[PDB]
Amino acid sequence: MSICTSEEWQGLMQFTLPVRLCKEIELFHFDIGPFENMWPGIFVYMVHRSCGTSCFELEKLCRFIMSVKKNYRRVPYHNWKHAVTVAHCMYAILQNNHTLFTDLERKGLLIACLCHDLDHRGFSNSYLQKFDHPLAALYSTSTMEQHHFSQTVSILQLEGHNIFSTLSSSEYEQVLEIIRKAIIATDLALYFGNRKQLEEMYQTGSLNLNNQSHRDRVIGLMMTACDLCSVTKLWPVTKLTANDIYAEFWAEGDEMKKLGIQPIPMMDRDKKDEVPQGQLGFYNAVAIPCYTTLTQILPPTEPLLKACRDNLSQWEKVIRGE
Ligand SMILES: [Mg+2]
Ligand SMILES: [Zn+2]
């Protein structure tokens, strides 16, 4: 476990945000990349704007963030920058659907996003499972997600870190569940079933947001939507990130090789030609449907779908030499 120093959050409480960004965070395609220094501050801004200033305890929040920060590894993809990006997509969905969600749901969904990949190694579930690695035996399914949540909790169990103290033991235990379920939903295995169910539910007319089971399923889709949002950015950003993903996918497949296993096309660095054919598969199979159902459920999220289409169009172009 890694704790933030004394004078990191104190100088971060000093943090104020420039006007130009204030007006641009609100945008779905907004890219946080150009503002590394400013990332902790931006989350806070997003919290405040969505949850309220007097609402969260400030000393605690700032300690919480820099400790979340320091427990993200320096891996190519699933790092501190993934976290804030994913957090940002949430804020964008939330802002456009603010009232649909309660003040606890919004509190918890934003904190969950930031924490959803905590202590990621750059290794997939399947890897840790087909091998072991103690984590696949401790958490048998949704291996890494279960770790991610656990770590969130450990971070909350630190001196001055428990931002949720000021809640009622009723609310406190409610929000830990919203998080747990949220962090778990980002296991992409679940997503496929969850979308069809939701597809089904919307298509028949059954979907009801007062239904806690329905609700949970909707929140699920949101988490998938955010965890993937880099496919919703402008093309050059989108393309750069794919490098980082693969950087990890390959380092993984290499270790499969290193210990006598033959990795799929997607984690085979000698198979870089098939990538754009895989990306097209992934957009069509996974991302397009994901943002499609989500737009039906929540119409203020159609922009996310467009961005994704546009990016699919680009991938098609790479395939045909252009
Ligand atoms: Mg993850
Ligand atoms: Zn993720």
Curated annotation (Swiss-Prot):
3',5'-cyclic AMP binds at H78, Q279. It is found in: Cytoplasm, Cytosol. It comes from the Eukaryota. 3',5'-cyclic GMP binds at H78, Q279. Changing D117N: Reduces activity 1000-fold. Abundant in the putamen and caudate nucleus regions of brain and testis, moderately expressed in the thyroid gland, pituitary gland, thalamus and cerebellum. The active site is at H78 (proton donor). A divalent metal cation 1 binds at H82, H116, D117, D227. Changing D117A: Loss of activity and of zinc binding. Residues 5-322 form the PDEase domain. A divalent metal cation 2 binds at D117. It is linked to Dyskinesia, limb and orofacial, infantile-onset: An autosomal recessive, early-onset hyperkinetic movement disorder characterized by axial hypotonia, dyskinesia of the limbs and trunk, orofacial dyskinesia, drooling, and dysarthria. The severity of the hyperkinesis is variable. Homodimer. The tandem GAF domains bind cAMP, and regulate enzyme activity. The binding of cAMP stimulates enzyme activity. Belongs to the cyclic nucleotide phosphodiesterase family. Plays a role in signal transduction by regulating the intracellular concentration of cyclic nucleotides. Can hydrolyze both cAMP and cGMP, but has higher affinity for cAMP and is more efficient with cAMP as substrate. May play a critical role in regulating cAMP and cGMP levels in the striatum, a region of the brain that contributes to the control of movement and cognition. This is cAMP and cAMP-inhibited cGMP 3',5'-cyclic phosphodiesterase 10A.
